[PDB]
């Protein structure tokens, strides 16, 4: 991430929707690592493929890596 993502996407604003981000976050907060079977179960429920489950969790854990400890409302 260094002055990246300059390719302006006209195809769809948000790749995900409200219900998809519900299911994705619920799996993420119970376990930051979904196994091969948990990938498939999450995929059929969210209407996404395993490839889209890869992109979400790898990007999401990247932000999660920076332990900030900024305040009492989620460190």
Swiss-Prot record:
* Associated disorder: Parietal foramina 2: Autosomal dominant disease characterized by oval defects of the parietal bones caused by deficient ossification around the parietal notch, which is normally obliterated during the fifth fetal month. PFM2 is also a clinical feature of Potocki-Shaffer syndrome. Frontonasal dysplasia 2: The term frontonasal dysplasia describes an array of abnormalities affecting the eyes, forehead and nose and linked to midfacial dysraphia. The clinical picture is highly variable. Major findings include true ocular hypertelorism; broadening of the nasal root; median facial cleft affecting the nose and/or upper lip and palate; unilateral or bilateral clefting of the alae nasi; lack of formation of the nasal tip; anterior cranium bifidum occultum; a V-shaped or widow's peak frontal hairline.
Where's it found, cell-wise?
Answer: Nucleus
Q: Please state which protein family the record places this protein in.
A: Belongs to the paired homeobox family.
Top-rank lineage group of the source organism = Eukaryota
Q: How does it assemble?
A: Binds DNA.
This chain belongs to which protein, by name? Answer: Homeobox protein aristaless-like 4
DNA-binding span(s): 9-68
Q: Which gene encodes it?
A: ALX4
What's this protein's function? Transcription factor involved in skull and limb development. Plays an essential role in craniofacial development, skin and hair follicle development.
Query: Which part of the entire sequence is included in the shown chain?
Result: 209 to 280 of 411
Q: In which tissues is it expressed?
A: Expression is likely to be restricted to bone. Found in parietal bone.
């Amino acid at each position: 991430s260094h002055m990246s993502n300059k390719g302006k996407k006209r195809r769809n604003r948000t790749t995900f929707t409200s219900y998809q981000l519900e299911e994705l976050e619920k799996v993420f907060q119970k376990t930051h690592y979904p196994d091969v079977y948990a990938r498939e179960q999450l995929a059929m429920r969210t209407d996404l493929t395993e490839a889209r489950v890869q992109v979400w969790f790898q990007n999401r854990r990247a932000k999660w890596r920076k332990r900030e400890r900024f305040g009492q409302m989620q460190q």
